[PDB]
Design a protein. Sequence first.
Length: 453
Amino acid sequence: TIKEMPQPKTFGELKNLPLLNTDKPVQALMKIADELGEIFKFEAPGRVTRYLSSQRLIKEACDESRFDKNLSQALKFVRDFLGDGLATSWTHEKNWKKAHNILLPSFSQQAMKGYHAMMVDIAVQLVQKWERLNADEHIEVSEDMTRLTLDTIGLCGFNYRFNSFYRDQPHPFIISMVRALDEVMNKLQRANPDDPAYDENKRQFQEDIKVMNDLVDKIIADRKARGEQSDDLLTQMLNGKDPETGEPLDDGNIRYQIITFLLAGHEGTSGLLSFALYFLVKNPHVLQKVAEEAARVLVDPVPSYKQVKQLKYVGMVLNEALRLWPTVPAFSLYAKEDTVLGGEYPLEKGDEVMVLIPQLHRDKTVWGDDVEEFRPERFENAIPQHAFKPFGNGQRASIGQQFALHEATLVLGMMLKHFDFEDHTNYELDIKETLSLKPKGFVVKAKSKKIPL
Ligand code: HEM
């Protein structure tokens, strides 16, 4: 039956916008969803979207005959620096399908055998850093996972070394990228984002975009100077031809892809690794089970590709981390035609819906009563269509899913092979939002098991 859609408190002409005047908007949206249920409208000046939280509705949103990817307001702002790169292009834009076809083979399960050695290079640097800490020191978890994930995509993708583990001050590229993302988040909170009152933030934003483009220049210059032949992402982009069209990407689009991969390659995965260790230190029995599997499987000084694929319980741990805290916590869709959602909510062509992934992942009708518990065994055996969506949906799902999960499986495996962890501060979870999610202030101490590399 057609029903009126729930909607939270409005503030005159500002509509719902003041509800998200917070540094933790996705967490605030989860609270609204707790209060209003599976669907609610959220208006701000000049835009409307509808936040979905149940598998019953999200399964319909994920029907590609009915909905296509939408550029949320956040993506539209991110597009100021990512352009028509893969993540910020419309499905119908020429460069989407073109770049997709050119790059997809670079991200398959098979391409992972190729990247494995270089993933190991950076994982070893992480393990060595932690082996070299003195007794009175600790680990800043999200910070070190970011060093690893950035360096891994730099190296695997572009044969470029960020050398993040040689730095205690974060890489200039990351300083600017984080500030650009912070600006996007602040811009989402403005009534009139084009107001010339914000021309200063715009100045800084453009300076940070220049910094990102300066790094792209260095990556391209290094490629030309090192004068080696590689089959990495950049090589595929410079020479690869779209089999559908028979054209290569233009330099402008390649530049956008480089920045896209550096961002995306690192943000999601670093949060996943940090959430996973967090859950392990809070769920000691699960830790023991991971440690047992690492010790049992990782019998060589460094992991092989085949050994990583045998870390089945580590993979379950990672999926359960993604269930509770999917690190790219939403994605947006638009109605391809006039339709009715859920037998209940009429939509007009172009109307936007937002999939609130953390809420979908707490839907008791799919998962059972215990959704707040960290229980990797969930994945042991058979879950429903579109209940678990940490990598988005359909042909606009993450191109990085296998890359991210191979890396994180490798790294978490090595971490638990080589160390025991202590939650020395009895850390209370604090989730930082930079569009993506990651723990803030999560610290531990590691006690080496003294197993050489
Ligand atoms: C745990 C790690 C990661 C998570 C949770 C994640 C999540 C996502 C999600 C939710 C989307 C869809 C967003 C939307 O519909 O608007 C997406 C798209 C994307 N992901 Fe990831 N991802 C991760 C790792 C990576 C990595 C490692 C790469 C690259 C190396 C990457 C590259 C991309 C790209 C390029 C897209 C756009 C794909 C397309 O539309 O053609 N991702 N990912």
